[PDB]
Design an enzyme around this catalytic site. Structure first.
Site, PDB file in Angstrom:
ATOM      1  N   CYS A   1      31.298  36.071  38.764  1.00  0.00           N
ATOM      2  CA  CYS A   1      31.556  37.207  37.864  1.00  0.00           C
ATOM      3  C   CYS A   1      32.040  36.708  36.525  1.00  0.00           C
ATOM      4  O   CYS A   1      31.695  37.270  35.500  1.00  0.00           O
ATOM      5  CB  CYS A   1      32.566  38.187  38.454  1.00  0.00           C
ATOM      6  SG  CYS A   1      31.899  39.169  39.829  1.00  0.00           S
TER       7      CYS A   1
ATOM      8  N   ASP B   1      35.974  44.266  35.563  1.00  0.00           N
ATOM      9  CA  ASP B   1      36.480  45.500  36.082  1.00  0.00           C
ATOM     10  C   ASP B   1      37.868  45.603  35.505  1.00  0.00           C
ATOM     11  O   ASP B   1      38.752  44.808  35.845  1.00  0.00           O
ATOM     12  CB  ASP B   1      36.495  45.487  37.616  1.00  0.00           C
ATOM     13  CG  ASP B   1      37.041  46.756  38.201  1.00  0.00           C
ATOM     14  OD1 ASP B   1      36.811  47.833  37.617  1.00  0.00           O
ATOM     15  OD2 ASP B   1      37.757  46.676  39.215  1.00  0.00           O
TER      16      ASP B   1
END
Lengths: 279, 279
Positions: free
Chosen positions: A167, A190
């Site tokens: 990520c 996020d």
């Protein structure tokens, strides 16, 4: 603006945010190319707006650094955040074949060993692949200024072998006036969980190389790819920005450590972290 | 706040606030820069100094089919690579086994074949390696929301086998409201020379893939690592910031191209470009 970069980042994802769809199917508010610069001098960027998980961050990095890939080794530390991927069921019906908890060539493989053929977790890869993790420590006092100091988790041939694509893809380091600074490219982030954990994680990574290389700590640039808020957590996040964030903690190191691989969680002493209680 | 102006402030900030260094050649440097370029109805080709347009187009077409040959660019009288592909330069570092006009796996080959076995530019590598590009192209058609659409030029596998480490290390794409976006990571860049050149490179790539896919072009986020200004050009560019940038020109693509390297120099019509004169 040390703390308040994050705060408006996630207001910008609300006011100006664009509906997009998550890979789960839940809709998210999205924004691109976010950029924050966090200050690692005499402070540490553990966000006090919501309690960060400090145990996970440290022991995940030391898991990255040691060149270990496994679910157990974090499990053994009673940190279960990766153990949902290591499974008999997860691996197999995700179309995995043989090994009974490999994560694939995930981060920390791709740091210390690069292009090395992957059989299984606990087959030891020493002197395999290219070790990025430190070719930089090797670089840092060799050539302190450099454009070359980079650790790339993206190895697209190995990526069908990973349980998840990285990520946070890569980080690069920079040396000016006796101070170190690392920028990490987070391609998906996020704002709830992923990101402020990443900020802890990569900020910590400099602090290591800080006393290692005698270098103080400049700064941390957290660069974002798709930045997103999940639709649910809006009303839950909107209260979180309703909070006046409280001043940043300092990180300390008691043990002088020459070897990048020799670290562990009892080296790390934090000063004054008091986040807000959740709901 | 936007576009080429944001490119002066980078210039502005580094001149004032940068860091004196060596290379060698001295320079002023700062780290962790980002900025945004609107790709909607104008092309962010820079107007405070003239950027080579047929360099930018023809480099990419030659990135696109992945061939790396100095001899291929040179006949089109675009030669940025001859310094690096000439046998006076080849034979210095151990390229004594290498032919003239040959470089290595860098960029184009990596795009079109990754993890492959690098032989030489006389050899056709189709059926081999993995392609970062046409997959990225084919993703946007099937699952455009994916945040894993990524092309990174950094492969320490072939790094010793390329003349120079890739300057622009990765890109990411994005899809929101039918507008395809792109974010370029530069590990090093020249505010006066190389950056503007690679701002108009990936801009066009965004445009091409947009065209290929049928999506509009939204925005280009220029992400930088070390961003430097040579003291060779130090003064000449303080009068280059004295100028007010003229509005951006407009890229059009004439022939309808379903394929990615079917693209030729002649498909590109660039309207409204009037950069500022030498000195």
């Amino acid at each position: 603006t040390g703390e308040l970069q994050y705060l408006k980042q996630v207001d910008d994802i609300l006011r100006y945010g664009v509906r997009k769809r998550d890979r789960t199917g839940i809709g998210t508010l999205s924004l691109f190319g976010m950029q924050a610069r966090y200050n690692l001098r005499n402070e540490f960027p553990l966000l006090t707006t919501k309690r960060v998980f400090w145990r996970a961050v440290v022991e995940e990095l030391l898991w990255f650094i040691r060149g270990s890939t496994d679910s157990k080794e974090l499990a053994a530390k009673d940190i279960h955040i990766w153990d949902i991927y290591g499974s008999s069921k997860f691996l197999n019906r995700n179309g995995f074949h043989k090994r009974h908890g490999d994560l694939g060539p995930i981060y920390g493989f791709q740091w210390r060993h690069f292009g090395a053929e992957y059989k299984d977790c606990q087959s030891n890869y020493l002197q395999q692949g290219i070790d990025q993790l430190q070719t930089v420590i090797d670089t840092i006092k060799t050539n302190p200024e450099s454009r070359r100091m980079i650790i790339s988790s993206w190895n697209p041939k190995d990526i069908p072998l990973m349980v998840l694509p990285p990520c946070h893809t890569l980080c690069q380091f920079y040396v000016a006036n006796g101070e170190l600074s690392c920028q990490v490219y987070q391609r998906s982030g996020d704002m709830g969980l992923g990101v402020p954990f990443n900020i802890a994680g990569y900020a910590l990574l400099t602090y290591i190389v800080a006393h290692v290389t005698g270098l103080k700590t400049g700064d941390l640039i957290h660069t974002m790819g798709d930045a997103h808020i999940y639709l649910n957590h809006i009303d839950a996040l909107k209260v979180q920005l309703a909070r006046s964030p409280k001043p940043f903690p300092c990180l300390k190191i008691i043990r002088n450590v020459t070897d990048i691989n020799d670290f562990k969680w009892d080296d790390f002493q934090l000063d004054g972290y008091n986040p807000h209680p959740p709901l």
